Amino acid sequence: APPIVAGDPDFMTSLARGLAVIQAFQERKRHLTIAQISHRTEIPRAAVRRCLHTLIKLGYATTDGRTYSLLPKVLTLGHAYLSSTPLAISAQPYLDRISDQLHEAANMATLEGDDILYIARSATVERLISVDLSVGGRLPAYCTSMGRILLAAMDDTSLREYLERADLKARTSRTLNDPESLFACIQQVRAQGWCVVDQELEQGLRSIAVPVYDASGQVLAALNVSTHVGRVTRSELEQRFLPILLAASRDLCHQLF
Amino acid sequence: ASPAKRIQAFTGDPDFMTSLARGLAVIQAFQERKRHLTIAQISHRTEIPRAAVRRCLHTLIKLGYATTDGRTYSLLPKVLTLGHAYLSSTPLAISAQPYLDRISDQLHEAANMATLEGDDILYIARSALSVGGRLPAYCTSMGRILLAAMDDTSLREYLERADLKARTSRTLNDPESLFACIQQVRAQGWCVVDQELEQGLRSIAVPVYDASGQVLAALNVSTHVGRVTRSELEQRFLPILLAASRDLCHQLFG
Numbered sequence: 483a484p485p486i487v488a489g490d491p492d493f494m495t496s497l498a499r500g501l502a503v504i505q506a507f508q509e510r511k512r513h514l515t516i517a518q519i520s521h522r523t524e525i526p527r528a529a530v531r532r533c534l535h536t537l538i539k540l541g542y543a544t545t546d547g548r549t550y551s552l553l554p555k556v557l558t559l560g561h562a563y564l565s566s567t568p569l570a571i572s573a574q575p576y577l578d579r580i581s582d583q584l585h586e587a588a589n590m591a592t593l594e595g596d597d598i599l600y601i602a603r604s605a606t607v608e609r610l611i612s613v614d615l616s617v618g619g620r621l622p623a624y625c626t627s628m629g630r631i632l633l634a635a636m637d638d639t640s641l642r643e644y645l646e647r648a649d650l651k652a653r654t655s656r657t658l659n660d661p662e663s664l665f666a667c668i669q670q671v672r673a674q675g676w677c678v679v680d681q682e683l684e685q686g687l688r689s690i691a692v693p694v695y696d697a698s699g700q701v702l703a704a705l706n707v708s709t710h711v712g713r714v715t716r717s718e719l720e721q722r723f724l725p726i727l728l729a730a731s732r733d734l735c736h737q738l739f
Numbered sequence: 740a741s742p743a744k745r746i747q748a749f750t751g752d753p754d755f756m757t758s759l760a761r762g763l764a765v766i767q768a769f770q771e772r773k774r775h776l777t778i779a780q781i782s783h784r785t786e787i788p789r790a791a792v793r794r795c796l797h798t799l800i801k802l803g804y805a806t807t808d809g810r811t812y813s814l815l816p817k818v819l820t821l822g823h824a825y826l827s828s829t830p831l832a833i834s835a836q837p838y839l840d841r842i843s844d845q846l847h848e849a850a851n852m853a854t855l856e857g858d859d860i861l862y863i864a865r866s867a868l869s870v871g872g873r874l875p876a877y878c879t880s881m882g883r884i885l886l887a888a889m890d891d892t893s894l895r896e897y898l899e900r901a902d903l904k905a906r907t908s909r910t911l912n913d914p915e916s917l918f919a920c921i922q923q924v925r926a927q928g929w930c931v932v933d934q935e936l937e938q939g940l941r942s943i944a945v946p947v948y949d950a951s952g953q954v955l956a957a958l959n960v961s962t963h964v965g966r967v968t969r970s971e972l973e974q975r976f977l978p979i980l981l982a983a984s985r986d987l988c989h990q991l992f993g
């Protein structure tokens with residue numbers, strides 16, 4: 483190797499704006515201007531400028547005076563959640579055990595808005611469109627197995643509101659993407675207590691998911707196992723993966739509550 | 740210097756957003772707490788007044804970043820999406836991932852990439868600690884790569900400032916011994932740390948450069964004493980790491 487050489491009065495608007503400015507960077511690989519951030523967030527430019535100035539002084543962002551980027555310190559905000567949340571902490575040995583036994587990826591997600599949000603994953607690579615899925619990433623609820631678990635937990639009025647507004651695009655030719663077929667699908671998921679999705683999010687990808695409850699019988703999250711097409715038989719998901727996942731969900735609930 | 744002290748250093752700055760700074764500090768107050776917190780606990784750790792802690796928490800609850808039962812407070816998974824904003828907007832982290840995956844597959848060991856934050860290294864990508872986790876720089880192989888990249892004034896400032904605890908019987912724990920170690924890492928272009936952070940842990944790291952020769956980050960492989968000898972690290976792992984890091988630099992910067 484070569485050497486190394488040389489009103490609500492308690493709502494704090496500026497905190498809200500600063501977190502929205504951080505969110506404006508989602509999926510933007512080129513540094514951003516104030517104009518772009520203001521456009522995306524509908525926050526006035528002068529406030530965006532102050533937010534960025536504050537983030538820079540605190541080590542969360544950087545600039546050349548014209549454009550702006552985030553710094554790695556932003557990752558420590560998510561680490562504050564991961565290291566203070568029993569659900570995320572306790573689920574990791576379970577996902578690791580599921581994955582070691584099945585030699586497939588295992589995940590846990592919650593609902594955030596119209597998407598599922600990954601909170602913990604086993605140690606396997608799962609690439610969507612050759613990009614690793616990761617803790618903190620989001621996927622649409624209507625076309626994922628964990629999304630359908632979490633939509634099934636809604637009451638019918640909330641579910642219909644979601645289906646009349648959501649972007650139901652046909653991700654593959656298999657995807658259920660009209661409100662009547664999604665509603666009937668979600669009703670069966672309720673009856674079953676589990677959901678299989680077969681290549682409705684992307685070609686080649688199959689997953690099976692179950693709910694995780696708290697002591698009150700409320701759905702806190704979903705657990706799943708996710709696989710590629712030629713890695714499984716057609717009925718292995720239900721016969722092989724499902725009892726493992728049901729048992730893990732039951733064990734995690736008992737451990738926490 | 741408490742979080743409130745650091746915030747109050749900018750009272751003369753009219754564009755510094757005090758509430759944003761306190762809310763970020765309130766999120767940080769949860770680090771490694773393992774469970775939920777009261778207003779009084781958060782105020783004690785941050786030294787931010789309780790009224791302000793209350794208003795920040797309230798704002799986080801309204802925005803979906805936290806929850807409460809009226810006595811204790813917890814963060815919500817939406818906080819994770821703040822870190823994802825960095826990951827999905829940073830080509831270094833994005834492009835590093837296939838290399839880390841391939842390295843880990845070949846060696847059946849964990850491979851990581853880290854940058855320097857303050858006196859710690861900060862993990863920005865890993866292939867099967869977590870991303871966003873931190874470790875001290877002085878007794879880790881990536882830490883020593885990144886300290887080696889500093890100029891000598893910054894390195895000495897670090898060595899006088901940092902808390903150099905003896906974590907194992909092998910840890911180098913004084914500024915003179917550590918400076919000598921860093922000069923050897925500079926001469927080498929790589930670093931092996933053998934059980935200076937915890938028993939059984941051994942790792943090897945190299946720098947990641949841009950096209951102008953700035954060190955941007957460090958890449959490493961970490962192992963246990965079980966079956967990987969130091970000769971293996973230096974003769975088998977090191978050529979792989981050097982090749983991956985050169986590939987990454989060329990892919991990102993030409």
Ligand SMILES: [Cl-]
Pocket residue numbers: 513544545546549550551
């Ligand atoms: Cl920038």
Ligand SMILES: [Cl-]
Pocket residue numbers: 653654655656685
């Ligand atoms: Cl298709």
Ligand SMILES: [Cl-]
Pocket residue numbers: 670671676677678679
């Ligand atoms: Cl189903």
Ligand SMILES: [Cl-]
Pocket residue numbers: 635636699700701
């Ligand atoms: Cl429910």
Ligand SMILES: [Cl-]
Pocket residue numbers: 742743744746747761786787788
């Ligand atoms: Cl303060």
Ligand SMILES: [Cl-]
Pocket residue numbers: 496755756757758759
């Ligand atoms: Cl303010």
Ligand SMILES: [Cl-]
Pocket residue numbers: 775806807808811812813
């Ligand atoms: Cl709580």
Ligand SMILES: [Cl-]
Pocket residue numbers: 592593594599803815816817818
């Ligand atoms: Cl959330």
Ligand SMILES: [Cl-]
Pocket residue numbers: 878879880881932936941942961
């Ligand atoms: Cl190390």
Ligand SMILES: [Cl-]
Pocket residue numbers: 907908909934937938939
């Ligand atoms: Cl030891």
